[PDB]
Design a binder for this molecule. Structure first.
Ligand SMILES: CCCCCCCCCc1cc(=O)c2ccccc2[nH]1
Ligand SMILES: CCCCCCCCCc1cc(=O)c2ccccc2[nH]1
Lengths: 203, 203
C-alpha cells in the first residue's frame, strides 16, 4: 500500500516518528532511503509509485504531487580541523568557492539550486559517509546534516566553518511531497499533524 | 559613506536595530527602502553603489558581494475572509495555482524562484500596500510579511491560508549582502554580531 521515501539528510529519529504513526492507519508501509540529491528525481519516475517523500530538497510544483513543510533541521559546512580555511572565517567563508568541495552526486547528474555545489573543483560521492571519510581525510570540505557530524564535532575530528554565515548551523526546511490523492484523507492529515507536532524536538 | 538597502519585507523594527548600531562606527549612513522584488537587481547596478543589502530574496554568488543570514521572519498567504479558498484548506492550498494571485512586480520583469508567482493569473503591483488593498477587496490572494498583516488579521479583515502548508507562517530567511571590502572590517563584524543577537526577538 503506502510507500514513503526518506532522504539521508533526514535524522533517523524523524523516521521512527513517522513510521509509528502510519501503521495505526496503514497496513502495509514501505520505507525507502535515498540521497537527497536523488529524492525528487525518484518520485518523478511513475513506475516508482511513491506516495510520500520526505526531503530537504526543493522544487515548486511537481507532476502529481503537492508540497508542505514538516519542520526544520540543521546542516553544517565542515572540514578537517586544520584545513586551510579553518579558524580564519568571513573572508575565507567566501573562498569556499575556490576550495575543493565534496558534494553529493546525483544519478541524473542534475542538481537543484539548493544542492548544486558552490565551488569547483567538486568531487562527487554517493552519500554522506563517503563525504566525511574524505573531509576527515581531509581532501575538501562539505555540507552535512547535524546528526552525522555532531559525533565527530565534539570529538574534535571535524570543525565547523558555517558559523559566521549562519550561526547555529544552516537552518534548512524539511518538505513533504505527497501524492495529491492523499489531500484531505482523514489518515494523511493525522500523519502530518502528528509528525509535525512531534518534530519540534529534536531542535 | 555607508549605503544600505532594506527591503519592504523586513520588519520596520529590524531597521532601527541596524541603524542605531552603524552610527557608532559610521558617520554618514544612508538607508534605502526597496521592493524585495527589486533588492538584488538594484545592488547589481554598480552606479547604485550599495554596500549592504538586507533582503528576503536569494541568489547564490553575486558579482562583488557576499551573503550571510541575519535571522528569520514570517510571511503568510492571505485572502479575503470569504475568498472561495478560505476555510477549506489542503486540497484548496493546491488550487492557489488556479486562483488569481496578487504578486509583487519587479522593474526588470524578472523574478527569482523564491518570489516568482505560483499561479496565474497574476496581477502585479509595486508594493505590499497595493497588494493588500486588492486582497482585502478582494480580487486575488497574496503572500505578505507578518508585520503588515497581523493588524488586519486579528481584526478579521483578512484570513490566512498558509497554515496547513506551514503552520506558524512561512518561515523565511533574511539575508545580508555585503560588499566584500567589508569582510573582516572590525566595524561590519560588530554590526552583524549585534544585529543578529538582537533580531532573535521579534520572533
Ligand atoms: C558557508 C557557505 C554557505 C553555502 C551553503 C548554501 C546553503 C545550504 C544549502 C544546502 C546544501 C546542502 O548540500 C545541504 C546538504 C544537506 C542538508 C542541507 C543542505 N543545505
Ligand atoms: C501555500 C502556498 C505556499 C507557496 C509559498 C511558497 C513559499 C514562499 C516564498 C515567498 C514568496 C513571497 O512572495 C514572499 C513575500 C514576502 C516574504 C516572504 C515570501 N516568501
Amino acid at each position: 500500500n503506502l510507500r514513503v521515501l526518506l532522504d539521508t539528510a533526514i535524522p533517523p529519529s524523524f523516521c521512527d516518528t513517522v513510521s509509528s504513526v502510519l501503521l495505526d492507519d496503514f497496513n502495509m508501509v514501505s520505507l525507502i532511503r535515498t540521497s537527497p540529491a536523488d529524492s525528487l528525481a525518484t518520485i518523478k519516475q511513475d513506475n516508482a509509485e511513491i506516495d510520500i517523500a520526505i526531503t530537504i530538497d526543493e522544487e515548486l510544483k511537481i507532476s502529481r504531487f503537492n508540497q508542505c513543510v514538516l519542520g526544520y533541521t540543521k546542516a553544517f559546512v565542515v572540514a578537517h580541523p586544520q584545513h586551510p580555511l579553518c579558524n580564519a572565517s568571513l573572508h575565507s567563508i567566501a573562498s569556499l568557492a575556490n576550495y575543493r568541495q565534496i558534494s553529493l552526486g546525483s544519478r541524473s547528474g542534475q542538481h537543484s539550486n539548493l544542492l548544486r555545489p558552490v565551488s569547483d573543483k567538486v568531487l562527487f560521492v554517493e552519500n554522506f559517509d563517503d563525504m566525511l571519510r574524505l573531509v576527515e581525510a581531509g581532501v575538501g570540505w562539505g555540507i552535512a546534516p547535524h546528526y552525522f557530524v555532531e559525533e565527530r564535532l565534539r570529538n574534535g575530528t571535524l570543525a565547523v566553518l558555517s558559523e559566521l554565515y549562519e550561526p547555529g548551523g544552516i537552518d534548512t526546511k524539511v518538505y513533504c511531497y505527497y501524492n495529491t490523492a492523499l489531500e484531505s484523507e482523514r489518515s494523511f492529515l493525522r500523519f502530518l499533524e502528528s509528525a509535525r507536532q512531534r518534530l519540534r524536538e529534536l531542535g
